[PDB]
């Protein structure tokens, strides 16, 4: 539900 708001770098 909640969206990824940090890069795939972390």
């Amino acid at each position: 539900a909640q969206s990824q708001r940090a890069p795939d770098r972390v």
Partner: antibody
Amino acid sequence: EVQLVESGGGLVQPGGSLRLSCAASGFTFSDYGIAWVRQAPGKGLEWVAFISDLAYTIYYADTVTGRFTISRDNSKNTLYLQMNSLRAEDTAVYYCARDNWDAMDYWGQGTLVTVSS
Amino acid sequence: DIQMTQSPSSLSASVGDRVTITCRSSQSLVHNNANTYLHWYQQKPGKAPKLLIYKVSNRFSGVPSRFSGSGSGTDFTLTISSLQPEDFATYYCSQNTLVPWTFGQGTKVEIKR
């Protein structure tokens, strides 16, 4: 200097396919997620797909899932949207927008997809 | 799944008037990280939308100071403090906290002349 340029739009028969391309420029492309957002003529904005940073997470709108595939080539600085089984309901200006990691801050000028016989 | 409702859908105001556009959520837009991903867009005729405000109240680079944002949880607000002729457009709120990402319907601002 940040720019996103959509191409590959056009006329398609219903049931037909297109591959949209978004050529990124003027930032580190590999650092950001990229979204597609579409706007049917005279209508509001509809989000359709997102590919993360390194492609780990991918989101589709229900309206689009199963038919549209979002992909990216970081070494080419290009994003793609493969659109299969096009209905008339898909006629729209399709925008590629870079995501800050908090907001879609830079959008391209758009490419129009007209599904028609 | 978040329904974004704007008020009004359109309006006419004179130059120099204060204009308020309302956005309503069906669900809190506070993320797990404590941030609230509500953003506001301006779309002029045959041009892509431009980011005006991000995270409720942050004015995007190059956005004039007469555009501001406000709100928490469910109810948010865009203010144009002194409306200018170039401010003619459709304004959209959007959320990025949950998937799907969703926009409001738009609020068309017309300048009364």
